[PDB]
Amino acid sequence: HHHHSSGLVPRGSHMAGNLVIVCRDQDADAFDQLMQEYGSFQTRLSSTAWYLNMNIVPETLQEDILERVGKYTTLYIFEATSVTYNTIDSNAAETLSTLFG
Amino acid sequence: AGNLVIVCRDQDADAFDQLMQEYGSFQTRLSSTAWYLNMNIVPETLQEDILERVGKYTTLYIFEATSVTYNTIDSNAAETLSTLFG
Ligand code: NA
């Protein structure tokens, strides 16, 4: 099996808030530095996209990011209700089930 | 429609962008590896379609989104999100 899906359900250790944060390529490593502050509650999906499981209002997170990276920074923050995904990295698969629930 | 965010790894960015063109003005590219799509499509169907076309071993994430907040220099993204999301 390499296809998976989660309804990102707030049950037990899985927090209520499910966020996908996207920046432009130019700002990739700056956003990564910031995202690492959320510890095991985030994962980097690509150079410019992260998933974060945190109970934070998206507008509040946006203000927090803009205060740190600059008010003219591009960012998109989505609240997600599901995820459907594929990988062949057996180790990333395990991180992901637990992170997604 | 449904509101989807599609993410791929950096190594597949060109292939994904070519695929995403089929969705016309209903998609916008957010970064080299992320798109927004406003489309009535079942995420597993979209996944099967991408894997049949880009390769079965391809990493991909498709999220269903319920809200977006953004600040952007990309006029096409701003317009697409503000008009289509809801
Ligand atoms: Na097809």
Author numbering:
A (entry chain A): -13 to 87
B (entry chain B): 2 to 87
Could you pull the original sentences from the published paper?
BPSL1038 is a protein with 88 amino acids encoded by a gene annotated as hypothetical in B. pseudomallei.
The rBPSL1038 crystals contain two protein molecules per asymmetric unit forming a symmetric homodimer. The structure of each rBPSL1038 protomer adopted a modified βαββαβα ferredoxin fold. One end of the β4 strand (residues 61–67) from one protomer forms an anti-parallel β-sheet with the end of the β4 strand (residues 68–71) of the other protomer, assembling the dimerization backbone of the BPSL1038 dimer. Overall, protomer A has a well-ordered fusion 6xHis-tag (13 amino acids) at the N-terminal region with residues -11 to -8 forming an additional β1 strand. The β1 strand forms an anti-parallel β-sheet with strand β4. Both subunits (residues 1–87) are highly similar with an r.m.s.d of 1.3 Å over 87 Cα atoms (residues 1–87); the biggest deviation was observed at loop L4 and helix α3 regions and is likely due to the existence of the fusion His-tag β1 strand that interacts with the β4 strand of protomer A. In BPSL1038, the aspartate (D11) pair is 5.9 Å apart and located together with the S32, S33 and T34 residues at the β2-β3 turn that forms a negatively charged cage for coordinating a water molecule that is tetrahedrally hydrogen bonded to residues S33 and T34 from both subunits. The side chains of four BPSL1038 solvent-exposed positively charged amino acids (R10, R30, R54 and K57) from each subunit are systematically oriented on the potential substrate binding surface, with the negatively charged cage formed by the D11SST motif located in the middle.
